[PDB]
């Protein structure tokens, strides 16, 4: 048992009736002094270290060559000038076991935290030494955290793709299904999560070439995708992860959900494929009135109307489909389907729930397409256009496949530094650079959509940590007030940066003219409503920072109308799973799951108290399972009104909650504007 592990395990040894939280600083100090300083490869100077790293195929020389060595040395000195110290053992452990560069034999540490931050900043700046120093200050202050792919792989020759979220539209044809399998394997090989929309595939029992009862439905394609994701396991260290989304009005919806039942037969079970369901307002209306609903065979609709079922407005087309004899449909119980969804989410946490009308009533790019499905983390909500993959020697009709590179603001550190605007703009610039440097060679629609849309995802983390470290209950009205003001400011400054980038580069995203940004319909609520804090306590937290007013939003609206917007999508709140430890921040905007996180690494167990946890703020670090999920829904809906994409929203349920409680939580989320529901976690 190592000394640092012994010190960390002393956290739970209560002394004087209170946890010994100070043992974590001792634990991290001992961890460093006894493992990291010993196992760190020694270089005489930065020049020798950089030459060794570049020569040994560690660092790409393309990005480093853009700077004179004096500039690189200055950036590295800027990174080390802060004297950054990890405040807890878990943060340093996570960094030096997951992200710190290690020799090919994985026995020595080539990168410190400062070295990794400096390399990422140099990669971001793209030759701008002052920009690189600004990035170094942003990341060393831990105001902005690049996503795990960008942070880990940036500047590395062996690096994989800096983007990790991929959404693919699958067309209803064998050629398209084969291409989807190939692209899913190609993207998983790169380590990115791949989400597929199966709503266009015809249901089981549909005809292929005037041959009836030939189609196998979406479950056969799901088995193919599950096998493909299992094969492309990314060395096996992280098993291949894929998500399949199906509209609730698809015929195969019941079979689609049955793949996640434990009682399901093994020939139907899909082990490695997450499933999400897209629920239009029509289904909720049908269940509310207890009316009998119908699930439609997609190919009959496509033949009758020449357009896909999921390409149409179900709230306008459901009655026409029901009344159309040429459309094939079978009756279902919408309330029975909702209860089945709740039961499945309780048993396995699946499927993800996407409220299509909640997403598309605020979607700015409905002209390009409506948001038909989400990603593997349930927070990516963008317009997609399906591709037409034809026969060999036939030209393909490449559509738009969704992808975004992620970054997270550290709310606590952004508020402590009073640098919301600067942090947001620098994060937007870094995300734009990552997007511009991405080129996927086996996903034509992904690459085309990356070039055309320039979609980025700027999330946030440490909301609960910041609130608890400030004497604010997560469920309290003041917490929602702060979230409203902060995320309104984030949206304002991200829109301003996008417009400024469009002005500087002279280009907007493809089909920007038809977006709600161009027509000004996006800014209606911001020019009509004031989002300043309504509580004095919350308003004081923003002291020293300028909170945009309706006049500021009017000016920004005029500026956007003049110059346009560079990004079709800017904000999405991803889970931010493992990089939160490095930042010593709570995960995303969700409430903390546990006050002290007990985990076993190797054969020694480690304890991770929530950042800033102490006796004074112990009660404010309320666990999610003890929280009223209605208040969590209220907070997420408050945040979501300023996020153009979705928010990964996990439901934390007690074992005593029935399926009716889960159904009520989902119905309240739909009522409150929640776009997606990620997971049903039960204590």
């Amino acid at each position: 048992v190592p000394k640092w592990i012994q010190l960390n395990n002393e956290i739970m040894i209560q002394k004087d009736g209170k946890f010994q939280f100070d043992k974590d600083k001792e634990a991290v100090h001992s961890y460093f002094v006894d493992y990291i300083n010993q196992n760190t490869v020694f270089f005489h100077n930065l020049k020798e270290k950089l030459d060794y790293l570049v020569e040994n195929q560690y660092y790409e020389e393309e990005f480093l060559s853009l700077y004179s060595f004096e500039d690189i040395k200055e950036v590295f000195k800027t990174a080390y000038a802060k004297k950054f110290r990890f405040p807890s053992f878990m943060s340093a452990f996570k960094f030096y076991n997951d992200y710190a560069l290690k020799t090919n034999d994985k026995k020595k540490i080539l990168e410190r935290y400062e070295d990794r931050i400096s390399i990422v900043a140099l990669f971001f700046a793209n030759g701008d030494t002052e920009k690189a120093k600004e990035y170094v200050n942003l990341m060393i202050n831990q105001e902005y955290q690049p996503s795990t792919p960008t942070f880990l792989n940036a500047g590395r020759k062996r690096r994989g793709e800096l983007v990790s979220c991929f959404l693919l539209e699958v067309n209803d044809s064998l050629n398209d299904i084969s291409r989807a399998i190939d692209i899913s394997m190609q993207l998983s090989k790169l380590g990115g999560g791949v989400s597929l929309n199966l709503s266009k595939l015809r249901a089981k029992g549909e005809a292929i070439k005037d041959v009836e009862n030939a189609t196998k439905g979406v479950v056969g394609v799901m088995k193919l995708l599950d096998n493909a994701f299992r094969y492309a396991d990314q060395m096996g260290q992280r098993q291949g992860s894929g998500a399949a989304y199906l509209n609730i009005f698809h015929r195969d919806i019941n079979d689609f959900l049955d793949t996640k039942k434990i009682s399901a037969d093994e020939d139907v079970r899909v082990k490695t494929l997450s499933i999400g369901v897209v629920i239009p307002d029509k289904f909720v209306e049908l269940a509310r009135e207890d009316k009998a609903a119908y699930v439609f065979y997609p190919h009959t609709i496509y033949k009758e109307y020449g357009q896909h079922m999921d390409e149409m407005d179900m709230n306008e087309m459901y009655d026409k489909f029901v009344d159309n004899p040429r459309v094939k449909k079978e009756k279902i119980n919408p309330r029975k389907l909702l209860e089945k969804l709740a039961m499945l989410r309780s048993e396995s946490g699946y499927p993800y729930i996407m409220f299509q009308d909640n997403v598309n009533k605020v979607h700015a790019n409905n002209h390009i397409s409506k948001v038909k499905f989400s990603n593997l983390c349930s927070e990516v909500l963008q317009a997609s256009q399906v591709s037409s993959y034809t026969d060999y020697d036939e030209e393909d009709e490449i559509g738009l496949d969704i992808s975004c590179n992620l970054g997270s603001l550290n709310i606590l550190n952004v508020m402590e530094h009073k640098s919301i605007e600067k942090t947001v703009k620098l994060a937007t610039d870094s995300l734009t650079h990552v997007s511009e440097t991405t080129d996927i060679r086996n996903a034509p629609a992904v690459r085309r959509a990356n070039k055309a849309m320039k979609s980025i995802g700027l999330g946030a983390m440490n909301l609960h940590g910041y609130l608890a470290q400030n004497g604010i209950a997560y469920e309290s009205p003041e917490a929602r007030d702060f979230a409203n003001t902060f995320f309104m400011m984030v949206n304002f400054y991200s829109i301003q940066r996008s417009a400024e980038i469009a002005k500087e580069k002279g280009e907007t995203f493809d089909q920007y003219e038809g977006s709600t940004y161009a027509t000004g319909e996006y800014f209606d609520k911001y020019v009509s409503t004031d989002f300043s804090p309504k509580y004095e306590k919350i308003a004081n937290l923003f002291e020293g920072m300028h909170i945009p007013t309706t006049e500021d939003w009017k000016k920004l609206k005029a500026f956007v109308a003049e110059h346009g917007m560079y990004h079709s999508y800017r904000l999405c709140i991803a889970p931010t799973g493992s990089i939160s430890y490095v930042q010593s921040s709570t995960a995303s905007v969700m409430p903390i799951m546990e006050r002290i996180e007990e985990r076993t690494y190797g054969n020694s167990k480690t304890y991770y108290p929530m950042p800033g946890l102490a006796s004074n703020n112990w009660f404010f670090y309320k666990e999610a399972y003890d929280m009223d999920m209605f208040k969590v829904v209220d907070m997420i809906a408050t945040i979501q009104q300023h996020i153009d994409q979705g928010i990964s929203f996990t439901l934390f349920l007690k074992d005593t909650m029935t399926t009716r409680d889960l159904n009520r939580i989902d119905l309240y989320a739909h009522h409150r504007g929640i776009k997606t529901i990620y997971y049903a976690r039960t204590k």
């Binding site: 309330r335 209860e339 029935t658 009716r660």
Partner: peptide
């Protein structure tokens, strides 16, 4: 456990 959704469960 499993319990059915009543009409009032759709209003808030």
């Amino acid at each position: 456990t499993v319990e059915p959704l009543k009409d009032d469960d759709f209003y808030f």
